[PDB]
Nucleic acid binder design. Sequence first.
DNA 1: TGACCCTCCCCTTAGGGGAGGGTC
DNA 2: TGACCCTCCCCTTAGGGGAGGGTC
Lengths: 277, 277
Amino acid sequence: KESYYSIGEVSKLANVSIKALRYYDKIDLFKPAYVDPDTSYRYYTDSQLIHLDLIKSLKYIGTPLEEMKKAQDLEMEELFAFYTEQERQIREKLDFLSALEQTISLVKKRMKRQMEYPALGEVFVLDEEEIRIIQTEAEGIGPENVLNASYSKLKKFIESADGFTNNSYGATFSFQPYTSIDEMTYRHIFTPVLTNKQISSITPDMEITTIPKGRYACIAYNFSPEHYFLNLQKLIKYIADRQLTVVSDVYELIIPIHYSPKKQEEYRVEMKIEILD
Amino acid sequence: KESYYSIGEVSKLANVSIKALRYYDKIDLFKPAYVDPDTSYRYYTDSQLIHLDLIKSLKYIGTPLEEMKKAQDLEMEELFAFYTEQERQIREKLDFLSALEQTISLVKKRMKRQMEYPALGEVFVLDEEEIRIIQTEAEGIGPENVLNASYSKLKKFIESADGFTNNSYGATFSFQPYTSIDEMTYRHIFTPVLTNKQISSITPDMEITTIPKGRYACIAYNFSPEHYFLNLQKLIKYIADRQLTVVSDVYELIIPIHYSPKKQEEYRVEMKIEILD
DNA sequence: TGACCCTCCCCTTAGGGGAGGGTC
DNA sequence: TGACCCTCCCCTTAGGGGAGGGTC
Ligand SMILES: COc1ccc2cc3[n+](cc2c1OC)CCc1cc2c(cc1-3)OCO2
Ligand SMILES: COc1ccc2cc3[n+](cc2c1OC)CCc1cc2c(cc1-3)OCO2
């Protein structure tokens, strides 16, 4: 080859845009063999095309352009290692993505269950699978004064283990024949976990526990301050009428229907309590 | 909560940077409940913190910010679907990454073999594993006039199946007792394939074939115009002396030692030919 | 008085999309 | 004369890093 290739020829031959070529030129990653001193036209030698091989390959695997500059120097000996490195990072993304995929699936699983609920406002008994959770004591907190900010530390944990943040906010309280909401006080407030991934060094003011597998007398409904208590009451009554034996605290889960700052807020509330007979 | 949270409080509570908060404000993704008309200070209500849940989660899975805006509207019903979509894309990246990982491994495999070669300039017989390749006829092309551009269409194929571009350039020619390089003419020029991934609708001027598994009389060495022919000669002589039977064309593979535009170019050349006894 | 917060401005990857103007 | 090529400029994700200046 005693000639030269014009920018467009190289582009058609290497399947690399002219824009890409001008950029690799500016970047001093791949500069033409000769630039016409007048027209400023870019000209390339055939032997030089070989350098685009590495460039295109590294680009395919996401290597940053400036990163390539150092790679084009090493001589097959170290280039080997360079790849072993790239492999490590590739597996990194894979593990992340696999985990992420699993998480999403679980969020959907739980999400579907709330969508296929028997009936709102009515009490019923069903067999539940255990649900793992992270809890901390309520410290006086009760139905009338809980805040989203109250779940801050809990959420920081689930977040650094799941990436995803809890979908539901939970609380518990002694099963009593209350006559008023102000008589109520939460024992614990909790958030369920998704990934059981070893919780990054948990502090002792948190407990990794579970809402055990068993039979539960439940009731779900769309939140309304004047319905919260009356629904608790249905539950209390239902258990008394069938003479059931409660063997856990009442478990309370609040999950938002939407996260739109536009529409009026609405939550799904679910109270369940483990029973025996 | 009859008060407000200052930007920094929300930041500490939601584990979201103040910068991030100001940006989500500008973007109209998450704006404070109230902005002090004088100080311009940003103030947030506790109930509002709940909207950051979706934001943080979608952000964790790579959803673009403007994309989130539409997601915060849908009500759990469609939000479910939205995730099914996200799952599809997640698997997409996974397949890609898995493939990519496999590719890199192969490039390393081949790369290592060239690094652990018996001896340069000397002829020897070894048992080889089959190597799949894509070839096209040489059309007169020979050792003295092959160009990188000659492998253009071939490379466009391997590239759209492997992402990675071939590491070695190949050619073949009839095994003859040549007396001169100018007597030589390639039958085919080829590039080996990495992924056997169904080659995207291959045109008939290309053949998907293979350098079969078998015994080969080989010789590798660092390229030098005056060594190309003399090494071919060693091969021709070696086969004559042991009275071996050649049962293929001579296979020629050229692979660059580096892709640095700084240092002098250097290639690794390997000639092999399948024999019988 | 210190932390706390605000606006403004500059910077970052790898180019794609033109626009205005010469050029094999 | 048309394609081919060049330089210049604007634009793109999600903010982080200050800088200069008021503020619970
Ligand atoms: C976003 O999370 C929320 C959002 C809103 C919530 C609203 C209420 N609770 C938790 C909430 C919660 O818990 C996590 C506790 C039970 C309750 C009783 C009431 C009432 C409001 C509430 O008005 C008077 O009687
Ligand atoms: C980057 O790829 C290259 C680079 C350089 C190459 C150089 C030569 N060949 C292929 C090459 C190739 O093939 C793909 C064919 C054999 C040959 C005989 C010769 C000679 C040069 C070459 O000088 C006189 O005798």
